[PDB]
Design an enzyme around this catalytic site. Structure first.
Site: not given
Lengths: 189, 189
Positions: B106, B108, B112, B121
Site C-alpha cells: 500500500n 500513502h 511511504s 492499514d
C-alpha cells in the site's frame, strides 16, 4: 428490473439499453456489464454511465468449462431477471444457454430479437425489423441502417419483458397473453 | 511477477506500474485491475493498455463478509504474487489482509509505501521519500510533487519484490536478509 448485459468490442446496442432505463423506457436497472474482451469500448460506455463492468477474457482460464462456470458465477451475483446478449461473440454453451433459459435474449442481423434456446432454430423470434434496399445507399449505410433498427427494437422488447408481458413458455414466445408465431411483433389481439 | 492492482480513482499510480512492467523495469505483469468504484478513470487506463478490469460495488453485496469473500475469489483466479492497492478507498477486513499476507502492498500521500499487515492499514514501511515544499507552492503544486514521487517509489519497491529481494517475516520488512528500520530506507545508514 435486473438486467445484466454481455458484450464484445464497441457498445452501441448497450448505449441504447442504458439510455432507455435512464429515461424510464424499460422498467429496470442494468445492474452490471460483461465483455469477453478488454479494449471493448462498450466498457467505456458502461463506466461513463457508472455501471459495474466485468471483462472476463478466456486464456486467463484453463478450459472453456472453467470460463463458463465462472461467467455464470459473476453473472448470477447480480441476480439477473434478464441476461441480454448485445454483441457478445463467444460460442455459447449447453450449460450457459440452459442456465438462463427464458431470460436469455439476443439480437441477430437483418434485425431481429429472439429468445436463445437449445432448439435447433436458435429459439423463438420475438421481433423483426426489415430495412430497405432503397437506393440512397451511401455505402456504409448497409449496416448503419440495420443498426438504427437495432437501437429501436431491442429496448422495446427488453421493456416488454420487464413489464411482464413477454414470457417464453414451451419454446414459444408469448406477448401480452398469446403466442407470437415465427416472426412476431405488436398489438396483440 | 503476477501483479493485480486494486483502484478507486484516477489510476495515475496504476499507470506508473503498467508502464514500469511494460518497459521491463518491473519483472512482472499486471494481470487484472479491480475497483470499488464504477466510474474510476483508472479502469480506462486498464482498457487502453489491454488489462482486464473487474469492479465490485459494495451495494451489490448485502454483507461486507460477502463483498470480501467475492473480491478475494475474483482476485485469486489471476493467481497474484503481489496484490498492490493504489488508491483503493475501502475499509479492509481481517480475512482480506490475512488472506494476502505479505503479498499486499500500500502507498500513502507523503510518500511511504508499506506491507499491509492489519485492517487499520498498518504494517512495515519499506520505503519513504519526502518532498520539498517551497516558498509559494500551491496545494496543487505540492500534491503533484508528491504524486510524482509515488510514481517513482511504488514501482521501484514492486521491483525489489518481484525479484525476491523483498520479503516480510513477522511484521518486519526485510530487503536483502536485513531487517529494515521503522522508516524503511534501502541500504544501511
Amino acid at each position: 428490473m435486473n438486467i445484466v448485459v454481455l458484450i464484445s468490442g464497441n457498445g452501441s446496442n448497450l448505449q441504447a439499453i442504458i439510455d432507455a432505463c435512464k429515461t424510464n423506457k424499460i422498467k429496470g436497472t442494468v445492474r452490471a456489464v460483461f465483455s469477453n474482451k478488454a479494449d471493448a469500448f462498450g466498457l467505456e460506455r458502461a463506466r461513463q454511465a457508472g455501471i459495474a463492468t466485468h471483462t472476463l477474457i478466456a486464456s486467463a482460464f484453463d478450459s472453456r468449462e472453467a470460463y463458463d462456470r465462472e461467467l455464470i458465477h459473476e453473472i448470477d451475483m447480480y441476480a439477473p431477471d434478464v441476461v441480454v446478449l448485445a454483441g457478445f461473440m463467444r460460442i455459447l454453451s449447453p450449460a450457459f444457454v440452459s442456465h438462463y433459459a427464458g431470460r436469455l435474449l439476443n439480437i441477430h442481423p437483418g434485425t431481429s430479437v429472439h429468445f436463445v434456446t437449445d432448439e435447433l432454430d436458435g429459439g423463438p423470434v420475438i421481433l423483426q425489423a426489415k430495412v430497405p434496399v432503397f437506393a440512397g445507399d451511401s455505402e456504409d449505410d448497409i449496416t448503419a441502417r440495420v443498426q438504427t433498427q437495432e437501437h429501436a427494437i431491442y429496448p422495446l422488447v427488453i421493456s416488454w419483458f420487464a413489464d411482464g408481458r413477454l414470457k417464453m413458455h414451451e419454446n414459444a414466445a408469448w406477448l401480452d397473453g398469446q403466442r407470437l408465431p415465427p416472426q412476431g411483433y405488436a398489438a396483440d389481439e
